[PDB]
């Protein structure tokens, strides 16, 4: 093989909205995960079920690079067993998650003077999302007993709201680009990889 | 809809004490719960959102915990600035929101007996066909106090109105005024007008009185 | 970040009132707006929500068919129109921003707009003194501010020179439809006669300012 293209995900020019989170099924090699950990560019770098140093020391199959954009207060939601707007209705991590949560501030990138619609999120949902479920339905939500016929109005709301990304916003409301690395380790005797 | 219940109705603790406010939901609201502080005469102020997350600029002594149906607001060390009514609010079903009945947080002070004063109707007021006799209960604690109006040993009912002050900012005392309203011809159909007060700080009922003559 | 509401209003029973909420500072995109009222002898009561964009409102069950929430498609002014007003609708009505939704926050609130619903109209208050040789070393003096509409009335003593020991009670609504309260102050009994005591009643709604003389009078 050769090098592994983590630059395509982290250094992407544009990210997907959180409700329509992009998933990058990479499978070329293993890169030096110990290189990405000590990178000061990433402020949130939390791993689960495995230590960051031993990722290159371990062995897995498909490694999914989930990437999307949320706000600073919603960063702590990208974690197992959390709830809220994002964790329940946009991107859900399982209780037995095996991977890492990488996040960094993207106010210098995804914010525009006067707001930045673009990035959106699913407001509500009849039930909480399954783990790794992507809901991209743009159907008008029927909050009352009267049908909506796809019309916005009373008890008929558009299920997606746009983030209002301005540079003058507080850091808790600033855009944060998140990369969720999910990979399925092998099942060898505790000698080869264990 | 979802019903929210806060307990206790009133919590009275000294500065530095640990405060625990409960909020119980009629059904599971997941972590969809928010706490608020409203100081007197002010608009409410968010303290905790999503059950356990501290809002921006909120002092560290405020924290929240709980999920589903039972929620708890904890003030690790109460300060005088925390005298307020605290409301919880649900939002599990996005369109609608309901509030708890509120728990008024008082700065606990030792029980104190009220200083009682009685006031006959005035000269100028009697020129109008109405008479108002006021009984004052000044500086006391707790807020609970019973006021009974008697005219010639006959108890009155339905003809009086009470008014209670907010908790004083310096000595945490309350003040109460009860206004008995009767017609002018009725005020001269009787001689003695008394005001009997009973309170936790009193070992026996206290009564201040006056006769129609005297002055 | 600033939320500015309209001035207070008084309405007859059955009429309608429209409260404005002018907002500035932060992008109101991605920020919903609510309306919550607080009755004088009650807690917070949620009324409804309107989204930043085109209506898509939700009203509480108790206000279904009575409230209409709109926007000013320019000044980012959010309106709350309440029809068929009754005496119980007398309350302070707040507007509040909610980021995101669901959870969100009531981060910032308005100052509140008092709506007073009653059949009566603006009326000046009548003030009567309240005075006791008392029975103890402390004497009590007060002013009875009776029969005025609408709230509030402001009372000071000796043009503000007397502050400690002053207790002004909140107004009480009467069967006549008017408000009445009392403002008292505890002073040393031996000060009666030495210092002159005057209460300063000010009721701006009726352009009324009264300064009665609170001094005991043995007959
Ligand atoms: C992205 O590119 C910058 C330079 O353009 C580099 O410093 C950084 O390491 C890159 N990130 C990744 C994950 O390759």
User: Would you tell me how many other CB atoms lie within 10 Å of the CB of residue B62?
Assistant: 19
Gyration radius from chain C CA atoms: 22
Domains assigned to chain C: 2-117 (2.60.40.10), 126-210 (2.60.40.10)
Question: Residue C150, preceding bond cis, omega within 30 degrees?
Answer: yes
Q: Which of A10, A36, A45, A104 to mutate to test the pocket of ligand 1 (most atoms within 8 A of CB)?
A: A10
Longest dimension (CA), chain A: 63
Contacts of residue A40, Cβ cutoff 8 Å, sequence gap at least 6: none
C125 to chain B: which residues are within 8 Å by CB? none
- Residue C150 in contact with partner chain B when CB distance is under 8 A: no
Is B122 close to C130, i.e. CB distance below 8 A? yes
Contacts of residue A131, Cβ cutoff 8 Å, sequence gap at least 6: A92, A93, A94, A97
Residues C72, C91: Cα–Cα separation, whole Å: 24
Ligand 1 pocket by Cβ (under 6 Å): A 6-7, 10-11
- Phi/psi region, residue C157 (left: phi>0; alpha: psi -120 to 50; beta: rest), is beta
B115 to chain C: which residues are within 8 Å by CB? 138, 140, 186
Nearest to B82 by CA among B175, B171, B7, B11: B11
Report the b/e string of C85-105 with b at 16+ CB within 10 A.
beeebbbbbbbbbbbbbbbbb
Is B30 close to A83, i.e. CB distance below 8 A? yes
Residues C190, B16: Cα–Cα separation, whole Å: 40
Q: Do the domains at B4-107 and B115-211 have one common CATH topology?
A: yes
Residues C150, C118: Cα–Cα separation, whole Å: 9
Q: Which two tokens stand for residue B120?
A: 């006959």
Is B53 close to A73, i.e. CB distance below 8 A? yes
Does an H or E element contain C80, and which? strand C78-82
Residue nearest to atom 12 of ligand 1 (CA): A7
User: Would you tell me how many other CB atoms lie within 10 Å of the CB of residue A90?
Assistant: 27
Q: Which of A8, A37, A41 to mutate to test the pocket of ligand 1 (most atoms within 8 A of CB)?
A: A41
Q: Which two tokens stand for residue B77?
A: 């060390």
Residues A21, A17: Cα–Cα separation, whole Å: 6
Is C29 close to A164, i.e. CB distance below 8 A? yes
DSSP secondary structure of B77-136: S--GGG-EEEEEEE-SSTT--EE---EEEEE----BPPEEEEEPPPHHHHHTT-EEEEEE
Residue A58 · residue A47 · CB < 8 Å: no
Give this entry's resolution in angstroms.
3.8
Domain ranges of chain A: 7-185
Residue whose entry in the numeric block shows the structure tokens 């898509």 = C56
Q: Which DSSP symbol is given to C84?
A: S
DSSP secondary structure of chain A: -----THHHHT-SSPPBSTT-EEEEE-S----HHHHHT-TT-SEEEEESS-STTSTTS-EEEEEEEEEEEEGGGGGGSSTT--SHHHHHT----TT--EEEEEEE-HHHH--TT---S-EEE---SSPPPTT------PPEE-SSS--TT--BTTEE-SEEE----TTS-GGGSEEEEEEEEEEE----TTTT-
Domain ranges of chain B: 4-107, 115-211
Say which CATH architecture domain A7-185 belongs to: 2-Layer Sandwich (3.30)
Residue nearest to atom 2 of ligand 1 (CA): A11
Longest dimension (CA), chain B: 68
Q: Which two tokens stand for residue B144?
A: 């609970």
Residues C141, C132: Cα–Cα separation, whole Å: 7
Residue C144 · residue C191 · CB < 8 Å: no
What order do you get walking across the sheet with B70-75 strand by strand? Answer: B4-7, B19-25, B70-75, B62-67
Residues A53, A37: Cα–Cα separation, whole Å: 8
Q: Which two tokens stand for residue A177?
A: 């680009």
Select the CATH number that applies to the domain covering B115-211 from these four: 3.40.50.12280, 2.60.40.10, 1.10.150.170, 3.10.129.10. Answer: 2.60.40.10
Closest chain C residue to the Cα of B173, Cα to Cα:
C167
Look at domain B4-107 and name its CATH class: mainly beta
* Method in brief: X-ray
CA of A11 to the centre of ligand 1 (A): 6
Side-chain-side CA neighbours of B91 within 13 Å: the count stands at: 29
Give the one of A84, A124, A162 whose C-beta lies nearest to C30's C-beta.
Answer: A162
């Amino acid at each position: 093989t050769n090098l592994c293209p983590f630059g395509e995900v982290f250094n992407a020019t544009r990210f997907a909205s959180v409700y329509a989170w992009n998933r990058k099924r990479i499978s070329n090699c293993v890169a030096d995960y110990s290189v990405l950990y000590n990178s000061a560019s990433f402020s949130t770098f939390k791993c689960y079920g495995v230590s960051p140093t031993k990722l290159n020391d371990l062995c897995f199959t498909n490694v999914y690079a989930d990437s999307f954009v949320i706000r600073g207060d919603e960063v702590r939601q990208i974690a197992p067993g959390q709830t809220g707007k994002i964790a329940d209705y946009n991107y859900k991590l399982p209780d037995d998650f095996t991977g890492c949560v990488i996040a960094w501030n993207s106010n210098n990138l995804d914010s525009k003077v006067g707001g930045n619609y673009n990035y959106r999120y699913r407001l509500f949902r009849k039930s909480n999302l399954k783990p790794f479920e992507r809901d991209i339905s743009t159907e008008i939500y029927q909050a009352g007993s009267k049908p909506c016929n796809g019309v916005e109005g009373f008890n008929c709301y558009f299920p997606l709201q746009s983030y209002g990304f301005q540079p003058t916003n507080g850091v808790g409301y600033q855009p944060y680009r998140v990369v969720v690395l999910s990979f399925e380790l092998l099942h060898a005797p505790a000698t080869v990889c264990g | 809809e979802i019903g929210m219940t806060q307990s206790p109705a009133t919590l009275s603790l000294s500065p530095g004490e640990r405060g625990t406010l409960s909020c119980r939901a009629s059904q599971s609201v997941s972590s969809y719960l928010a706490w608020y502080q409203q100081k007197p005469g002010q608009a409410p102020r968010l303290l905790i959102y999503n059950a356990s997350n501290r809002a921006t600029g909120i002092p560290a002594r405020f924290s929240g915990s709980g999920s589903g149906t039972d929620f708890t607001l904890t003030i690790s060390s109460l300060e005088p600035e925390d005298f307020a009514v605290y409301y919880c609010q649900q939002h599990y079903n996005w369109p609608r929101y309901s509030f708890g009945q509120g728990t008024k947080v008082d700065i606990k002070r030792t029980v104190a007996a009220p200083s009682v004063f009685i006031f006959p109707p005035s000269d100028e007021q009697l020129k109008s066909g109405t008479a108002s006799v006021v009984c004052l209960l000044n500086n006391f604690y707790p807020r609970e106090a019973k006021v009974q109006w008697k005219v010639d040993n006959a108890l009155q009912s339905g003809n009086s109105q009470e008014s209670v002050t907010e908790q004083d900012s310096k000595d945490s005392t309350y003040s109460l005024s009860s206004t008995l309203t009767l017609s002018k011809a009725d005020y001269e159909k009787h001689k003695v007008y008394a005001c009997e007060v009973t309170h936790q700080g009193l070992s026996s009922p206290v009564t201040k009185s006056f006769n129609r003559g005297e002055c | 970040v600033q939320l500015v509401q309209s001035g207070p209003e008084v309405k007859k029973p059955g009429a309608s009132v429209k409260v404005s909420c002018k907002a500035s500072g932060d992008t109101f995109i991605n920020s919903f707006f609510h309306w919550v009222r607080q009755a004088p002898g009650q807690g917070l009561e949620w009324m409804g929500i309107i989204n930043p964009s085109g209506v898509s409102t939700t009203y509480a069950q108790k206000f279904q068919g009575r409230v209409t929430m709109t926007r000013d498609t320019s000044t980012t002014t959010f309106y709350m129109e309440l029809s068929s007003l009754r005496s119980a609708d007398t309350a302070v009505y707040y507007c509040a921003r909610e980021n995101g939704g669901n959870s969100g926050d009531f981060d910032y609130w308005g100052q509140g707009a008092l709506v007073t619903v009653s059949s009566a109209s603006t009326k000046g208050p009548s003030v009567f003194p309240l005075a006791p040789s008392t029975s103890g070393g402390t004497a009590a003096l007060g002013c009875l501010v009776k029969d005025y509409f609408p709230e509030p009335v402001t009372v000071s003593w000796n043009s503000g020179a007397l502050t400690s020991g002053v207790h002004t009670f909140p107004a009480v609504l009467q069967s006549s439809g008017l408000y009445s309260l009392s403002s008292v102050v505890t002073v040393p009994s031996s000060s009666l006669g030495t210092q002159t005591y005057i209460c300063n009643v000010n009721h701006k709604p009726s352009n009324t300012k009264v300064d009665k003389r609170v001094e005991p009078k043995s007959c």
